[PDB]
Amino acid sequence: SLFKDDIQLNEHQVAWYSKDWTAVQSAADSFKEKAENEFFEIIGAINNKTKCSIAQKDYSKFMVENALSQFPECMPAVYAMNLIGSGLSDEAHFNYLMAAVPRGKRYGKWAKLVEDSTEVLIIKLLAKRYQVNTNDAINYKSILTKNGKLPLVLKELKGLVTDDFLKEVTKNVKEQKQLKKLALEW
Amino acid sequence: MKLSKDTTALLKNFATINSGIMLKSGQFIMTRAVNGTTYAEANISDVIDFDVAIYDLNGFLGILSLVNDDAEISQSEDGNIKIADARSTIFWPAADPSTVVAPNKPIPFPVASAVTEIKAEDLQQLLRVSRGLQIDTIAITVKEGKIVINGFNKVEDSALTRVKYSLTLGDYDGENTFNFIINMANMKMQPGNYKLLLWAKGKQGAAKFEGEHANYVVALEADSTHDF
Amino acid sequence: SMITVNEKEHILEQKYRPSTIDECILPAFDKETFKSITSKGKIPHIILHSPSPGTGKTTVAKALCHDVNADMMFVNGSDCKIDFVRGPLTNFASAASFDGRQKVIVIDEFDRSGLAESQRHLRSFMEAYSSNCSIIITANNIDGIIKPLQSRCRVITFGQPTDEDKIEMMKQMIRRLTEICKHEGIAIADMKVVAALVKKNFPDFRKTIGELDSYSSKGVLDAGILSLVTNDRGAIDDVLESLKNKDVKQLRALAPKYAADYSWFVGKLAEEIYSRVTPQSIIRMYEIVGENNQYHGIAANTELHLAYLFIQLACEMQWK
Amino acid sequence: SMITVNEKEHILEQKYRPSTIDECILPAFDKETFKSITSKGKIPHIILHSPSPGTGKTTVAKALCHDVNADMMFVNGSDCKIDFVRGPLTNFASAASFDGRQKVIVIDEFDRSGLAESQRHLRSFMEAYSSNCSIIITANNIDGIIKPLQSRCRVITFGQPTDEDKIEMMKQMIRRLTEICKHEGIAIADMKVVAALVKKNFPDFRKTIGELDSYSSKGVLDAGILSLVTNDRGAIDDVLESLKNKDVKQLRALAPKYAADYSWFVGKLAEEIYSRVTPQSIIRMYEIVGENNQYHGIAANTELHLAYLFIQLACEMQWK
Amino acid sequence: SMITVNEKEHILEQKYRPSTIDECILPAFDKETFKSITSKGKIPHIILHSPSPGTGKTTVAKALCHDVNADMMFVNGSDCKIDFVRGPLTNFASAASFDGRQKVIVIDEFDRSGLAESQRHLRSFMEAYSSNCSIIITANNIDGIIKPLQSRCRVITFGQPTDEDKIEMMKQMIRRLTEICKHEGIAIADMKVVAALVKKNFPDFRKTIGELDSYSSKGVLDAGILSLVTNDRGAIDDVLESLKNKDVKQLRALAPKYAADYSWFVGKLAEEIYSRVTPQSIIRMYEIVGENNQYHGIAANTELHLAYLFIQLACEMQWK
Amino acid sequence: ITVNEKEHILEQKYRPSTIDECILPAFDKETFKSITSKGKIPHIILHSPSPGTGKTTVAKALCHDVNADMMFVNGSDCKIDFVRGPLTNFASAASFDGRQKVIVIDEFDRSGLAESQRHLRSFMEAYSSNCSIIITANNIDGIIKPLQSRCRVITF
DNA sequence: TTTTTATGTACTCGTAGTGTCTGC
DNA sequence: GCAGACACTACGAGTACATA
Ligand SMILES: Nc1ncnc2c1ncn2[C@@H]1O[C@H](COP(=O)(O)OP(=O)(O)O)[C@@H](O)[C@H]1O
């Protein structure tokens, strides 16, 4: 930083004028800001019995169908659109639901399961090792934990935790915490 | 038949026009761009002793670069192409002359409309600069009774206005006004000096490059203007 | 004769593809609307869409260019990706047609979903090059053409003739077939078989010709070949009689007989019961057979699933 | 005259594309917002989006430039990739203007998806280069323009005119159509015809003119051509009428007609019955057609399985 | 022999796959229609579809090419994605067949849903290359072939012989099997067992041979082996008895037993309950079983869907 | 009796080596011995449906008793491109040892597998000399007919 | 007061890593 | 001779689509 009179140019001017596109890249990347998904405006239109505002937009038969699945009162008409959904106008599918799901309201939270992803690991690593599927892999964990303590099985198998396998189990640094955890208390 | 580094040369050129080629028995080869933007023709040393269709012209020119100059090209008993090098033999396909785009007959130019020339040296200076200067469109017009070429960059000025480049080609003897516009994309011809015969009739028109070795004929573009 | 033969090919629905716009069999207003164009001497942008195949789209695309002496470039739609447009199609369109000809780019079968982005690049292209060059599009399903492209084009919609046109167009095809027969050495013993071919698969004049190819196995169309085309293999009398009598031992027995072509038998049944039963029993027989038809092919044992239709009928169906 | 003719072209909806910002038919507020801009003399960053095609977007862009005597680079949106923005777009902005001319860049049809990177890249290009030049963007779907751009830009939405802007704008266009008929040599015997073209196509002026081309085939717009423009669309009328009347002989007959493209016909049916039937009959027509659609392709005889749909509808569907 | 042996393989229903078109066991008109082609010496576009497997499609595809001396390329349908067509298939078809042979591309088992887009690219291809080259398609389920492709092809439909052809074709297979026996060293003590194999799984000539393989365990077909082939069970007594008694623990247990051939078991059930139950319980058992039959093959767990039939019956069926 | 002495789970280390060690009913054991008799294996589908009967075991066995060069693969893992890449890389390959190649697919009656199963129609035919396929199923109907045609279907 | 199912296929964009052709 | 520069390849990310 010489010359000491430079009318500080913004992040972008520096980049572009000098022409280093990786600076240009961090700069552009700055606007990444990605969400959208007005899906609930369509969904809430079907609950609260309001004006459509559609076919102009991008409709997910699955988003809607699934969002409505949250509420037992809708199921009869969500189900109907299941067996019959394929081959309905993206629009027809919206016209039905509107003429089907009677009351309206919903607050957000969708149902997801509990994953002890310690436990998800142990099961996928039995499933891989023995080329058996998940339900059997289960029986496996039990008769090992029950008898043979399966530290040994965990001991012999740890060898392949291959970090790509990890890409299948969970999505983040919690993954890198497992990388260590199975490599540990056997 | 046997092909010489001279002719293998003139072909790598016709590969920049049509990916394929039609060659019928003789001393004469023509090709034309699939979209009819460019037509090339030439007379050659090596003598062409059977007809055939070549789908891949540039990849077979690639495979003939691996044998000796003495290599004997023959139709294969099995009808494809046999290249016999001394210690070796290569086998290359033939397609039917339906899938390669041949012109019918060797399109003869009309009586020209205006004529100039260009030196080998000065062709270099055009092509080679276009890249740097981003000259994607050029125009042959008259300036001070002396014909000049003009480079432009069509994306920058759609109107062919700020002329980024110019090369004076010789004196203009007759009296007519013209702007002929050629797409740099059609300039596929190899380097060297060319007699330049251009012709125009209204919404008709064309530009023939008459070389020493082969002839080239290139379409003009539609914003081209003239009275002829 | 008045007919075009390509003579470079053997496949016969393609040997006889029409050369000019007059040869094409078209609805009244559609012909007129093309002759009109071939007159103005210049071609607008045009979309020609079926969705029933073989109504003449890809023929008329080629036709129009012929009748105007276009300088034409034909392209497989599915080969027409974006960089194709950028390089060759753009070179072609920017090229001065030097002998003063309309340039026309025919993009055949452009309705693939994947080509959306190519069609988008195209929307500003068709405007830039509109003086020199025009685009003819063929598609089976329009909705695969982005709206902005349908704005830019004259959209002509094939194969929806009026009740009046259908009858006339068919009559025109019967003649056109006859003249193909004369040419190919097929002899026609019964004309009813030429008519029945045309009616059978109407909207589509391609399979209509290649059906003539494959029913010419023996080099004559006689009233025997007529049996196969119209095909009724039928004597349904045995089942109809057992249904009247409302017995089973007989029906239960007939089921495995028709298990063979179920699709045909269900037709011949709906056809002949419709006349033989009461009006409000007609509304039921469709509910009964129509349902049985739906689930066929899910049904494990076809023979049994056919029995279940017979019982269902004998009970609810009524007549004298 | 007052009208622009390009005279370099024959395609007529493009021969007559307006030159200035006045020539345009725009809603009140928008037109003024545009004059006001060409007044203050320098052009702000603008995004122009329809989404109905042919509302004037790309025309109003070219005009603002003519009215500012701007130095313009017109680019194909689909051609504008990251390297263009780095390249000849920066080359342009940074290179010098001694004309004292607003430097404007028109990016036409910028709504493609994969341009996300070219877009983020521009939104920054704007901060570094904003004071050399300015950017007008044409789009059909705005959503295809990253949100950071809609921010920095004035976003004017064509196509959604007030109720009064509908009424005046059409008048302005009826007048405009008549003027094109003066030049092209078309005679107007019945004017109700020029009003028909305009009402029928309204939001889209491009097809609106094009349809003027295709209906001038004979050279006069007369009371008979009225009957064609106005005449009432869909050919599903025969089935819709038979369903109202709850008869069979007719429905039973129409089935083999639409057996051809079932997938299309079922669409056109769901589309046109949805308006023509009672609200709780709407919930049933979907159950009825939605099921019939599921099992199609299992169904042996497609023609029959289509009949079974017709009967099912005529019974349960009720309406006036 | 008169018979073809491939001798490069042991799997016997494939050792004996017919070399020529004469060897194939085909319906009257279907043979005739192929001999006709092999004459003209050029092959059209052809679709050969079952949907019952092992009727001779993939054999006749290879056959026809032999009887014409085609220059042939065989392809797995599912391997036939779009870029395959673009590169290899297109190279092949554009290649001059230099020895003057028909080029024929056999695309075996092309009915996958995923191949739709490849089939679309294909529609313009089959037209461009129609002089040089033709395409033979095999599919189990037609509806997996886009309509525009069925237009372009002669669609021959296997496995629906007439009442006459069935009888003839079977007779031909009994001879064909006998000759295989001579060749493999299997000896036939009772011919009734060779006839019963053919009838038992008729439409399908493949499992018809591989059934001959597995009933030759002891190297002779005696009237003892005849017992097993014609066998089935007939022992439905266990289920019938549990249904009378209206219990579950037993029925619930029998379900997984008959889960194997559901189609057969449902037949033997309708057969034997029809006599053993009351008249108005007969009308219900058909409704109950008829429905259970329809939805089979939609049903996820066949075993359970069979249990649901047992419960349904035990409740409503009332009889002594 | 066989022991696999590197394995930690009972059922996996006591799995019967031969078509003998297995406990089966009458026409079952006969029909299996009758098969290994011919020294080359056809296509085969095996199904219980009552599980734990030995399905998956009898497969690894029939291979053993033929000195088959056997590739074992779980069905759940048999995706479309698995078939394309390895299983094809396998059946396309000739063997030095000149044995029969065989592919056991355990429990192929799962769901997404559906489109894979269709790829095989024309595969099981295209290498029908080299190698053959043994398929295991708890429910048959979950195996598309055109496979049941290509395979000998024994039922336990 | 919300928020992403499975399996296969296709097109386009961007960049980085590989090549060959060229210039002291 | 190398190093520099140009061109062509491939993989990763994004996007969209259809059938179950
Ligand atoms: N017929 C049998 N004889 C001996 N052990 C058996 C038998 N069937 C199953 N097993 C035991 O089951 C284990 C594996 O069973 P498996 O074949 O996977 O059953 P399934 O195929 O029904 O899943 C073997 O280790 C074996 O000891």
Ligand SMILES: [Mg+2]
């Ligand atoms: Mg076509």
Ligand SMILES: [Mg+2]
């Ligand atoms: Mg536009």
Ligand SMILES: [Mg+2]
């Ligand atoms: Mg097959």
Ligand SMILES: [Mg+2]
């Ligand atoms: Mg198992």
